[PDB]
Symmetry: D2
Subunit: 259 residues, 4 copies
């Protein structure tokens, strides 16, 4: 039950949320994992510990993904620790809601530096280091293409940008035999989801009980449940298999068919 045995994965923002779920599912299948974290050092070591309990190797490495020089440092350290890399999961990100009239250059820069520029440099580093048969997977969101959501231009734009990076990088990574895809999840139970899901729930309002949100979202899902980090980690695991080689340069929505 170890299709990824002998491979090395790097996941940005793997200390918690989706990042953690991806790190765990990759490790459960044999991959050694570099658990990057921005500031959640304790959560990251906890993930390394969870990996160990699953028989997987891992290492927590701090790096501020919104700073390109730190992304380069992160990769240098990861390669120094595990000797090479195969899979790169660009996951770090932030939600953001703001009246467009109130958006300042500072807020704009903060959002794009992490959500977009950070992913560009993580992808550049993947092109630089990923071994043949490798995989680079960026993170967009269904919000990049959704309609009817207000005060969300920074988030929608920063995620849509990454979809353009995916198609470009797939061409650029071809000679190296590394595929590049982009995942676009629907709602997934995490801290970000608990803070922002009301904006997506049918009839949602600020202050709506989380259980009601969860129920409204699950009811809009063909599978009648909300997604969890493990659902994303399992799908990413499948994309990391040799079997997924012919899937390249694609934006894949991971929604269970819901929202």
């Amino acid at each position: 039950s170890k299709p990824l045995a002998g491979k090395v994965a790097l996941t940005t923002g793997a200390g918690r949320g989706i990042g953690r779920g991806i790190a765990i599912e990759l490790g459960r299948r044999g991959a050694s994992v570099v658990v990057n974290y921005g500031s959640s050092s304790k959560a990251a070591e906890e993930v390394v510990a969870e990996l160990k309990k699953l028989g997987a190797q891992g290492v927590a490495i701090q790096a501020d993904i919104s700073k390109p020089s730190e992304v380069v440092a992160l990769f240098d350290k990861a390669v120094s620790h595990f000797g090479g890399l195969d899979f790169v999961m660009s996951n770090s990100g932030m939600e953001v809601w703001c009246d467009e009239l109130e958006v300042t250059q500072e807020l704009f820069d903060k959002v794009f530096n992490l959500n977009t520029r950070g992913q560009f440099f993580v992808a550049q580093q993947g092109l630089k280091h990923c071994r043949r048969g490798g995989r680079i997977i960026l993170t967009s969101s269904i919000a990049a293409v959704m309609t009817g959501i207000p005060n969300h231009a920074l988030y929608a734009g920063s995620k849509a940008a990454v979809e353009g990076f995916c198609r470009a990088f797939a061409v650029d990574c071809g000679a190296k035999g590394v595929t590049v895809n982009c995942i676009a999840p629907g709602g997934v139970k995490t801290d970000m989801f608990d803070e922002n899901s009301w904006h997506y729930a049918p009839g949602g309002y600020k202050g709506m009980p989380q259980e009601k949100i969860d129920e409204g979202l699950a009811n809009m899902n063909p599978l009648k449940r909300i997604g969890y980090p493990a659902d994303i980690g399992r799908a990413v695991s499948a994309l990391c298999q040799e079997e997924s080689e012919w899937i390249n340069g694609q934006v894949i929505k991971l929604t269970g068919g819901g929202i």
Copy 2:
């Protein structure tokens, strides 16, 4: 190396081409396979034989997919033979080129009966029989969304229709715990490819040597090679795994990043 052990798959038009590649890759991973064929009985038994050599169980069952009553019969027989079904691969199809002015109702009907109606009924039968955790996968083509291709409205329209079926059926199959996706391949080495690839090759013309076509197409691929039935079968295998559960209602292009 048997993630699909104990599962039963049905593949329409599995006697040759992509269908055969899908049947073989599913069987290589543990699935028992119903090899449907329209008229290629000998190729189909050959596939059943190849499956046996891989340690997989298979059975060839004739059914004209362009006739709904025969699709229903095909499923009844498949269920009678293997006791149930988990994965349904709707693959049968035909290419078609025609000056739009020259298209007759008869040609229109012939194309849609197989490429579209056939897939609708195969999907209906999947909803009717697929067990929980099951998978239904329809076959479109990148030609459904390509621009610049002449005399191809019947093929483009018949394939685009199936993408609408995919989103609809995903909602309809949810309660049963069966996901529904659609694959849209780029060029894949088969009889259809050898007869029709010139239409897609850059600078292609009728009569262009097949080796030149192959070289032109491979050069337009990031992976620097053309796709083969095994590439499609491997990707479909990954989609049939439990790990792919959160991918639902999606049209996934299988192109290696090329055309």
Copy 3:
């Protein structure tokens, strides 16, 4: 205020609904209009009368769009009456809801014959007759790409097919200097909307008062109102202008930004 002066338009199913709104807006701008109708003869003559009151010329011509030979007859008569054609609006269509398990070949055929095959032949006739600078516009629906709607595979698939026709026909009509686009409306106040809108309203149920439906849909629209046939006719008018020449082979959603 007559940008379409001297041009001749043919609109299928122009006796009522969206078709009527398109016929009226084209005539208001100078076009002579062939008002096709399947069985609503009285509504069609009413439209011809409304056109006359606007100073536009029109003629009602019966033709069952689900029968290719009648589509050919319709065009022969239209050309006999006005001497040529410039704009072809393929609008006739039907909604359809059905448990996929209950769909029969007869229902399938009925839906595709009108919604898809009919549009293919109307487009073929446009290629055959449209004068240089002409326009062919097909009708899809946002339902072709929507997710989360149950018992709707026949409608979603029959409309998605037309999007493939649009891209194909644009290539095929180029030499003749005729552009081909496809409109995909959101909800538009008509008989079809009054019978089917509950399926699209947030929290909709069969039996929900139409005023509540209208209010729920309008609230989901940035423009805070539901669309009407005139909104569609105005947009189609703009697409029929010489100014729209560079828009070709596109599926354009006409939703006011809503649903």
Copy 4:
């Protein structure tokens, strides 16, 4: 022949290229135009002069669109000069080709500051100032969604981002009665096209004669010709008409059906 009579338009980067073509076509139809320019002061005054010869009013106003405070200043001046605004055309942009490994933070920032951040602030200013019935139109490119193009991640990503802004801003501008759309042109004869078109021509190479490029691109167009700034200006003119009100939150490809 003045559908836009009495309206005021602002076009970023209107001194030359597509921007100039848009300014001229809007003015030809009655709009007073604010011709913004970054550094081409002489070209901009030339455009103001061309507008005058067409009987349209115009004013050249310098503003570096890559600097948000200057975008705000540009709008303050435009409103001071013409008393209000109706149409905002966000057009300024740059092409960029670079081996992804060689991209520096400085290059990244330069590209996104103009192509993406600049458009966000132009859109914010449109929301702030556009009168009811107004229009905001952003500029993407078919390159945002194209496959097979190397060394182009910064351009593809910076343009794809704007498509996300379009959907978001359409929701945000609804209450004010201002629609927001995004145009995605194919090749259009301009300085940028003459410097970069080889990258898009079938079989293109650096150093390919421009006439051969033009011929190769035109041959890939259903209309058998390359697009020009006037083609874009005419389409934008149609989108600025009252008739286009129901088209909102859409990315419209302006390609004549080609590349």
